[PDB]
Design a protein around this ligand. Structure first.
Ligand SMILES: CCCCCCCCCCCCCCCCCC(=O)OC[C@H](COP(=O)([O-])OCC(O)COP(=O)([O-])OC[C@@H](COC(=O)CCCCCCCCCCCCCCCCC)OC(=O)CCCCCCCCCCCCCCCCC)OC(=O)CCCCCCCCCCCCCCCCC
Ligand SMILES: CCCCCCCCCCCCCCCCCC(=O)OC[C@H](COP(=O)([O-])OCC(O)COP(=O)([O-])OC[C@@H](COC(=O)CCCCCCCCCCCCCCCCC)OC(=O)CCCCCCCCCCCCCCCCC)OC(=O)CCCCCCCCCCCCCCCCC
Ligand SMILES: CCCCCCCCCCCCCCCCCC(=O)OC[C@H](COP(=O)([O-])OCC(O)COP(=O)([O-])OC[C@@H](COC(=O)CCCCCCCCCCCCCCCCC)OC(=O)CCCCCCCCCCCCCCCCC)OC(=O)CCCCCCCCCCCCCCCCC
Ligand SMILES: CCCCCCCCCCCCCCCCCC(=O)OC[C@H](COP(=O)([O-])OCC(O)COP(=O)([O-])OC[C@@H](COC(=O)CCCCCCCCCCCCCCCCC)OC(=O)CCCCCCCCCCCCCCCCC)OC(=O)CCCCCCCCCCCCCCCCC
Ligand SMILES: CCCCCCCCCCCCCCCCCC(=O)OC[C@H](COP(=O)([O-])OCC[N+](C)(C)C)OC(=O)CCCCCCCCCCCCCCCCC
Ligand SMILES: CCCCCCCCCCCCCCCCCC(=O)OC[C@H](COP(=O)([O-])OCC[N+](C)(C)C)OC(=O)CCCCCCCCCCCCCCCCC
Ligand SMILES: CCCCCCCC/C=C/CCCCCCCC(=O)OC[C@H](COP(=O)(O)OCCN)OC(=O)CCCCCCC/C=C/CCCCCCCC
Ligand SMILES: CCCCCCCCCCCCO[C@@H]1O[C@H](CO)[C@@H](O[C@H]2O[C@H](CO)[C@@H](O)[C@H](O)[C@H]2O)[C@H](O)[C@H]1O
Ligand SMILES: CCCCCCCCCCCCO[C@@H]1O[C@H](CO)[C@@H](O[C@H]2O[C@H](CO)[C@@H](O)[C@H](O)[C@H]2O)[C@H](O)[C@H]1O
Lengths: 96, 74, 55, 51, 110, 103, 82, 145, 149, 59, 54, 32, 51
């Protein structure tokens, strides 16, 4: 509230300088309202727009013809076997 | 520190083929985008084939190191 | 003279009732007041036997 | 912990790390200068301009 | 692989509407289990023909890669006919909704 | 001052006949009982739900063509009701968009 | 046993499975705090209590944000100003 | 088979490198939370800027532009489910107003396209006799020296 | 032959728990004193304390504007100098005065010292938690400065 | 500093951010003075992305 | 000279970029529980929001 | 059937149907 | 303001924070669905090889 001619974002809209226009719309409005989203537009369906959900579409099906294969295939190890040597695991886990 | 060393080695051996397939592919794509004539293209086809063979070599190396790193006695 | 009103009736004391007809009326009034050539124009629509793909 | 993340796509076939498309306002070409004249070659479908 | 021409002809008959009435009449006194078993048996008959006849017979398309090339060609045809078409449609959709490349835009800066 | 610890305190257990494998092979009967009872309960419930429905459907649509007709009509009715609800919500959304345009 | 390729899982386990007791303790403490809050609410309060909120400082001389209440020096015919 | 493998040595649940071990590891990561959808308090971390989300929104709003509604969904996710009274910074406010302006222009001018709004479509309307001319040279501005 | 008549599954559970506890005591007794005490009491205790404090209390990163306002930590050990960005865990009832005293070691603090978050000054008779909730939501970085003006 | 006397538009382009921060602080001060709070909902089932992750408490 | 403009930029799809749409996507459609929830609230006399009061 | 004669080991492991009991036990978090 | 230190005792949260980052960035989105399909495929291949 100090530099009015230099701070136009805090100034009234040009329709306010015009001296002409149940309940009526306000006569005085500022440009600082542009810094708010729901100043002029309504807040309708504000907290209900993230609730419109749609399901995924992936199908987990792939025929598994094993009659074509006669050899084994390599397989990964995902976790260490804690059912054996459980008490020493923190002590031998760092080795190889 | 051994866990960090091991994970670094594992990730490098796992991404080696991805690198060979992606970054060298980008280089080949640059060359394709820039080249127009026929002699250079004739000579560059062989570079592409060499990249094929190199990708397969990297895949073999990664398979070897991964079967070494994911082999457990018990 | 203390209030910014044209008349003394400030509207009903209860909210409206949900009505497809009232919604259509308000939407048509807003469209007429805006007068925007370009509303409802669809430059590209997903090709399908269905009129509205998706919605 | 309040800044948002950029989408991640990585595979043997495609990725989203070799380029940057920019923001919604400040956009930029994802392909670099050497391959911009050959953009057609990096597409499965291409619909040209009207002129 | 084999009988691609017969498969095209089957698709044609299927799209022909008169065949829809013919199938409606044939479905009188019929069960879903029977239909499913018949289709599964047809597919098995095709694959069994392949498995048996590949041992002694060679098609006009025989090549040093065998049926692998025919299967790759089937896959590539499916790809270019269906998936690339869907990609074209999705591209036009994205270009009308956000602009070209709109699905790969960075998040709004904070 | 000598050894204070026994050998089993250090040496690892047998590789193929170990504590956990023996324990789980001993628990196998109880686990079989438990999981079989649970699965039987679930299956009996699902069957009690499915038998009457399949009967009521076949009693009125005994043929494949009739079953297909009923399935298609069900799909169409579901889609139509969903479309009614969606039309209402779309009218709301259209009003909001018009107010944004007005702003 | 283990291997270099299992370094991720080994580290994760070693650093996480010891935290499960603490996680369960935190959950139990939260349950007990909720129980005490609900018992206090049932007993009665001058101003309301927000259950799922971190802190509730409101009383007869304090706002719901830790500041003194305005216009609370006198008494009101309708009772509490809230 | 899966049940029998549990009592065999080195094949209990996800331990080992058997197929049953792979299946149990898959079920374990499914039973975990890491692959479940994010909550509303976290949607705007990744999901609202996602290609799948954008494409789905565009597809299920056939002839519309959901940029503005996405901005508003972000505002919601940050205000109503995370507790932020000021969700938008200056950049986000500018983006919202940019999308609002684009909506206005699109509904005002029929067929407006890229140079003025971020939008491209192929089936355009042309006059019939389209003239092609060279643009005028850039205006000479006065300069010192 | 599963189960016995007259015995209860709860009695079986009790017996099993007794067996487990006895085995644990035996294994702890026949173990190295160099490793067992540590691995069983000191690492669990520290991990428990850290996790509980992090998941229950709420912390703030404290900074100070100028070096002349730094406290005097020359006497106390393990911290002979102030470092900005320090994580400080507090209770929900803590005020700005209590925070200031905790920072300056219950000793005479400088004059006109005040706390700010995201550029917004706090009152001294204000709850830190609520003031942060109001001014800097989910950005608890506090700054101590001198307000002469 | 931006010389708004002779470049008002250019300077406002720089200072509107501090104006916006002042606006926010005004609202915050008002809501602290007049006790304004809201009913927060219960904690979400996946508040933590990973069980081993710490859930840092925020006021 | 702004309405009915020509295609100024090219439209394309980069190789192997995903689409995330199945073959029944066109038959798929959206839905919100808000209308049904409002009906149920009105029928069961559940707490109304204050926006009902002008 | 009574509580005691149900939770007796013999009847609990031989003749009883512990399906519902163990299902309730597994789903306890849901009910809580 | 970005020199936000933290107690050295919180280094135990290393793997927790790593997994949380990987979850918020990859696992709980479409790339995470692809990773889940990759795990299912590992199971598929193991079963195929056994048979
Ligand atoms: C040789 C192998 C066999 C070949 C034949 C296979 C094809 C059979 C299908 C034939 C029917 C086609 C329909 C024609 C009528 C016009 C409609 C139309 O075509 O639009 C569809 C589409 C374009 O659609 P659009 O432009 O978006 O507009 C409307 C939409 O389509 C539609 O509107 P919408 O979006 O609203 O609809 C949504 C929804 C509607 O549909 C649905 O919702 C569900 C539909 C699924 C129904 C499932 C069956 C129901 C079963 C019920 C019973 C169950 C129990 C019994 C069964 C148990 C099973 C064990 O989804 C769909 O649309 C599904 C459409 C599927 C398209 C066909 C996909 C196959 C592509 C070609 C594969 C080629 C393979 C390799 C060939 C190798 C040859 C060398 O175009 C095509 O699909 C083209 C088909 C071309 C067939 C080519 C056959 C090979 C010929 C080779 C020629 C050589 C040159 C080829 C180049 C490569 C050479 C190497
Ligand atoms: C355009 C090509 C590019 C396509 C799109 C790009 C796709 C790339 C992916 C490629 C994937 C390929 C799919 C591999 C899966 C296996 C397919 C397979 O082996 O069986 C195919 C299938 C053979 O069925 P099959 O189960 O082996 O039983 C054979 C019969 O028993 C009959 O027994 P047969 O002993 O009497 O004869 C056996 C066989 C003999 O096949 C051969 O050995 C080829 C004979 C000539 C040697 C040189 C071939 C290349 C240059 C000449 C042919 C140009 C067309 C390209 C043909 C590519 C296939 C080799 O018959 C044929 O396949 C006839 C194919 C030639 C039809 C020519 C139609 C001309 C119309 C187009 C205008 C001219 C071309 C325009 C320029 C195109 C440049 C790309 O061939 C058919 O298309 C059946 C046609 C049924 C009548 C349809 C109504 C007439 C429409 C004519 C077009 C038919 C579609 C062909 C589209 C290509 C022409 C536009
Ligand atoms: C070298 C490496 C080795 C090591 C392996 C390392 C990797 C290990 C890990 C595993 C890999 C994980 C990697 C991460 C994956 C993430 C990416 C991803 O998955 O999606 C990407 C990719 C991205 O697509 P997008 O654009 O993002 O769209 C995503 C949508 O969600 C999806 O798009 P969409 O929904 O549009 O596509 C689905 C598509 C296909 O969907 C299906 O078809 C459903 C699947 C059913 C399969 C069973 C039916 C088989 C029937 C065969 C009978 C043919 C006749 C027999 C002829 C014999 C002689 C040849 O639908 C259609 O195109 C139209 C078909 C509609 C009808 C389907 C329902 C009816 C089925 C019955 C036919 C009835 C026809 C009646 C006609 C009407 C008459 C009135 O997704 C896809 O492309 C999905 C389709 C992929 C198909 C690939 C084609 C090759 C399949 C073979 C694979 C290898 C086989 C191995 C041997 C086993 C077979 C023998
Ligand atoms: C801050 C630090 C951050 C650091 C980074 C951190 C990173 C994050 C955290 C990471 C944590 C680690 C997590 C693990 C890593 C994650 C990896 C991951 O999730 O993947 C994501 C990533 C994908 O994620 P995305 O976001 O969706 O990427 C974009 C899409 O992928 C784009 O899709 P697209 O447009 O490119 O389309 C691709 C297309 C690709 O489709 C194809 O490639 C299929 C082509 C088949 C052609 C021939 C088919 C013949 C069959 C005919 C059947 C009968 C006729 C029926 C006719 C209809 C069917 C044709 O669709 C598919 O991918 C289909 C996949 C589903 C089917 C899988 C089939 C597996 C079969 C395996 C067979 C095993 C045989 C063993 C025999 C051993 C030898 C004795 O993975 C990929 O790289 C995708 C490509 C994967 C390669 C699959 C290739 C399979 C090819 C099998 C060929 C078999 C032929 C064998 C012949 C040899 C014997 C003669
Ligand atoms: C809830 C989710 C669980 C899912 C994952 C777990 C797998 C699901 C299957 C159920 C798991 C439990 C299987 C137990 C099998 C053991 C049966 C058995 O007979 O064991 C021998 C015991 C001892 O029997 P006994 O020695 O007294 O008499 C019989 C003697 N013999 C065997 C020689 C004939 O029998 C029992 O009393 C029943 C014990 C099982 C009941 C308890 C379940 C254990 C799991 C909880 C662990 C914590 C215990 C403390 C609980 C305190 C409760 C307040
Ligand atoms: C989805 C999750 C799947 C993963 C599985 C998650 C659940 C299972 C995870 C288990 C894996 C981790 C297990 C590591 C265990 C290591 C702990 C340990 O063994 O301790 C080190 C010590 C080390 O002993 P050590 O040093 O002599 O020898 C260790 C190994 N070497 C020889 C190589 C050095 O182990 C013990 O000796 C005791 C272990 C049993 C006691 C366990 C703690 C409870 C003790 C309570 C009794 C207290 C009595 C107090 C009496 C005081 C007066 C005497
Ligand atoms: C090329 C090298 C690649 C190596 C990468 C492999 C990563 C392997 C590490 C993953 C396993 C780590 C074990 C973590 C256990 C943590 C301790 C624990 O027990 O916590 C249990 C906890 C479950 O708790 P809740 O979520 O609360 O359950 C709620 C039920 N509704 O477990 C989990 O969270 C699951 C953890 C998921 C790990 C991340 C999954 C990564 C996907 C890997 C598969 C892709 C292929 C990987 C390559 C294979 C390499 C052999
Ligand atoms: C996780 C890592 C391992 C997996 C690797 C995944 C694929 C790697 C991506 C391709 C690497 C090369 O990528 C190539 O260099 C950079 C990538 O930013 C881009 O280059 C572009 O961005 C950089 C920004 O750093 C600019 O300096 C440059 O002027 C511009 O042309 C090129 O357009 C791209 O072709
Ligand atoms: C002996 C005490 C009981 C021991 C058993 C403890 C089991 C507790 C773990 C169950 C899962 C809890 O997970 C989560 O934590 C607490 C309840 O605990 C709830 O948290 C929410 O409600 C509680 C009420 O109790 C409030 O104090 C809290 O402010 C709020 O965030 C979440 O709604 C719940 O989803």
């Amino acid at each position: 509230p100090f530099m009015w001619r230099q701070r136009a974002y805090c100034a009234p809209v040009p329709s306010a300088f015009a001296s002409q226009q149940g309940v009526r719309k306000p006569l005085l409005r500022s440009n600082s309202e542009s810094l708010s989203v729901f100043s002029q537009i309504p807040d309708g369906l504000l907290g209900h727009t993230t609730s419109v959900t749609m399901g995924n579409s992936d199908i987990f099906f792939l025929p598994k013809p094993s009659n074509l294969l006669k050899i084994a295939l390599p397989a990964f190890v995902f976790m260490p076997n804690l059912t054996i040597f459980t008490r020493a695991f923190p002590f031998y886990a760092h080795t190889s | 520190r051994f866990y960090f060393m091991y994970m670094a080695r594992t990730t490098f051996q796992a991404v080696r083929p991805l690198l060979a397939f992606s970054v060298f592919g980008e280089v080949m794509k640059l060359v394709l985008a820039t080249m127009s004539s026929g002699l250079f293209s004739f000579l560059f086809s062989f570079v592409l084939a060499f990249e094929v063979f190199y990708f397969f070599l990297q895949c073999y190396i990664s398979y070897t190191f991964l079967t070494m790193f994911f082999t457990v006695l018990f | 003279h203390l209030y910014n009103v044209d008349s003394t009736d400030l509207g009903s004391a209860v909210a409206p009732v949900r009505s497809k007809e009232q919604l259509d009326r308000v939407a048509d009034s807003l469209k007429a007041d805006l007068n925007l050539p370009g509303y409802g124009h669809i430059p590209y629509k997903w090709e399908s036997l269905r009129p509205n793909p998706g919605a | 912990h309040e800044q948002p993340y950029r989408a991640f796509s990585l595979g043997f076939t495609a990725n989203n790390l070799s380029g940057n498309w920019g923001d919604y306002i400040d956009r930029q070409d994802n392909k670099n200068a050497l391959m911009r004249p050959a953009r057609m070659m990096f597409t499965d479908v291409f619909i040209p301009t009207t002129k | 692989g084999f009988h691609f021409q017969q498969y095209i002809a089957m698709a044609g008959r299927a799209i022909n509407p008169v065949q829809w009435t013919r199938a409606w009449r044939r479905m009188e006194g019929k069960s879903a289990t029977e239909v499913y078993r018949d289709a599964l048996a047809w597919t098995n008959n095709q694959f069994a023909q392949i498995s048996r006849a590949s041992q002694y017979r060679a098609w006009w398309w025989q090549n040093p890669l065998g049926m692998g090339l025919v299967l790759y060609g089937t896959y590539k045809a499916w790809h270019m006919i269906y998936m690339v078409r869907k990609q074209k449609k999705t591209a036009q959709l994205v270009a009308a909704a956000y602009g070209q490349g709109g699905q790969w835009l960075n998040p709004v800066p904070r | 001052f000598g050894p204070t610890l026994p050998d089993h305190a250090y040496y690892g257990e047998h590789a193929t006949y170990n504590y956990f494998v023996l324990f789980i092979r001993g628990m196998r009967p109880y686990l079989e009982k438990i999981f079989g009872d649970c699965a039987s309960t679930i299956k009996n419930a699902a069957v009690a739900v499915y038998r009457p429905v399949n009967a009521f459907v076949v009693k009125h649509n005994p043929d494949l063509r009739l079953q297909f007709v009923a399935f298609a009509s069900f799909i169409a009715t579901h889609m139509a009701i969903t479309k009614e609800f969606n039309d209402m919500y779309q009218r709301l959304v259209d009003i909001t968009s018009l107010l944004e345009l007005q702003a | 046993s283990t291997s270099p390729g299992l370094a991720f899982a080994n580290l994760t386990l070693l650093l996480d499975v010891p935290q499960l007791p603490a996680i369960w303790a935190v959950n139990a403490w939260r349950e007990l705090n909720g129980l005490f809050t609900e018992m206090k609410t049932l007993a009665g309060t001058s101003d309301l209590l927000y259950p799922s909120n971190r802190y509730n400082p409101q009383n007869e001389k304090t706002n719901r944000m830790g500041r003194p209440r305005k216009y609370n020096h006198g008494e009101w015919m309708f009772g509490n100003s809230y | 088979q899966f049940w029998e493998a549990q009592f065999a040595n080195r094949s209990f649940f996800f331990f080992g490198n058997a197929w049953t071990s792979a299946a149990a590891f898959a079920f374990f990561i499914w039973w975990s939370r890491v692959f479940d959808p994010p909550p509303k308090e976290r949607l705007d971390r990744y999901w609202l800027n996602s290609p799948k989300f954008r494409i789905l929104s565009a597809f299920h709003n056939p002839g519309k532009r959901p940029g503005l509604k996405i901005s508003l969904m972000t505002y919601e996710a940050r205000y109503c489910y995370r507790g932020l009274d000021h969700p938008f910074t200056l950049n986000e406010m500018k983006d919202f107003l940019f999308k609002l302006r684009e909506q206005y222009l699109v509904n005002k001018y029929e067929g407006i396209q890229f140079p003025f709004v971020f939008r491209q479509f192929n089936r355009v309307s042309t006059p019939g006799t389209l003239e092609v001319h060279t643009s005028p040279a850039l205006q000479q501005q006065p300069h010192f020296h | 032959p599963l189960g016995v008549k007259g015995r209860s599954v709860f009695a079986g559970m009790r017996s099993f728990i007794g067996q487990r506890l006895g085995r644990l005591y035996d294994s702890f007794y026949y173990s190295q004193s160099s490793t067992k005490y540590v691995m069983v009491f000191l690492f669990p205790a520290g991990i428990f304390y850290t996790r509980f404090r992090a998941d229950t209390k709420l912390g703030y990163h404290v900074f100070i504007n100028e070096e002349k306002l730094y406290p005097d930590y020359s006497q106390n050990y393990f911290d002979t100098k102030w470092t900005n960005g320090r994580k400080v865990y507090l209770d929900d009832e803590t005020t700005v005065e209590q925070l200031k005293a905790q920072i300056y070691g219950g000793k005479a603090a400088p004059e006109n010292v005040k706390v700010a978050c995201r550029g917004r000054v706090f009152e001294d008779a204000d709850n830190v938690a609520m003031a942060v909730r109001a001014f800097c939501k989910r950005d608890p970085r506090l700054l101590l400065f001198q307000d002469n003006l | 500093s931006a010389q708004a006397r002779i470049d008002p538009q250019g300077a406002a382009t720089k200072c509107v951010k501090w104006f916006n921060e002042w606006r926010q602080c005004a609202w915050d001060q008002e809501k602290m003075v007049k006790g304004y709070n809201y009913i927060e909902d219960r904690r979400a089932r996946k508040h933590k992305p990973y069980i081993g992750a710490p859930d840092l408490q925020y006021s | 000279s702004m309405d009915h403009g020509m295609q100024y930029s090219s439209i394309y799809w980069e190789t192997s970029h995903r689409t995330y749409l199945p073959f029944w996507a066109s038959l798929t459609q959206k839905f919100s529980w808000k209308i049904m929830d409002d009906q149920i609230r009105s029928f069961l006399r559940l707490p109304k929001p204050v926006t009902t009061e002008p | 059937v009574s509580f005691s004669q149900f939770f007796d080991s013999e009847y609990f492991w031989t003749k009883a149907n512990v399906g519902p009991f163990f299902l309730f036990l597994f789903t306890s978090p849901f009910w809580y | 303001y970005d020199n936000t230190a933290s107690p050295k005792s919180e280094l135990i949260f290393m793997a927790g924070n790593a997994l949380g980052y990987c979850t918020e960035r990859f696992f709980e989105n479409e790339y995470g669905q692809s990773i889940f399909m990759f795990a299912l495929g590992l199971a598929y291949l193991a079963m195929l090889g056994h048979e």
